[PDB]
Design a protein around this ligand. Structure first.
Ligand SMILES: [Cl-]
Lengths: 33, 33, 38, 38
């Protein structure tokens, strides 16, 4: 119930953290240019 | 160069759009509860 | 506690709205970089 | 146009900051839902 949504939202927070991390890696690539 | 970062950022925008879409699906699951 | 579910729906909705605004801005930066790129 | 790369770095940095703030808020909503959940 609520637990199904807790699992699904946790997955999305994990996905969102990957977005931020990977954008940061691109920022370093660009900062260097 | 810039093209490598354009590809990598596009991938992250695609990932971010999945975050928003999937959170919205969980919101519907919760709104219904 | 049912007030609780409604509160979290409203809260998460606000975050989705902010994610959508981020995605719009990132798409704009992508265009900016393409203009440098080609 | 080099000003251009720097501008996009600053712009994307602002968006990463906003994503990090979203993630913090979503983590808080996750805790709220867990409190309903268990
Ligand atoms: Cl993924």
């Amino acid at each position: 119930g609520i637990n199904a949504s807790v699992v699904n939202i946790q997955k999305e927070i994990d996905r969102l953290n990957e977005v931020a991390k990977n954008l940061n890696e691109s920022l370093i690539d660009l900062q260097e240019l």
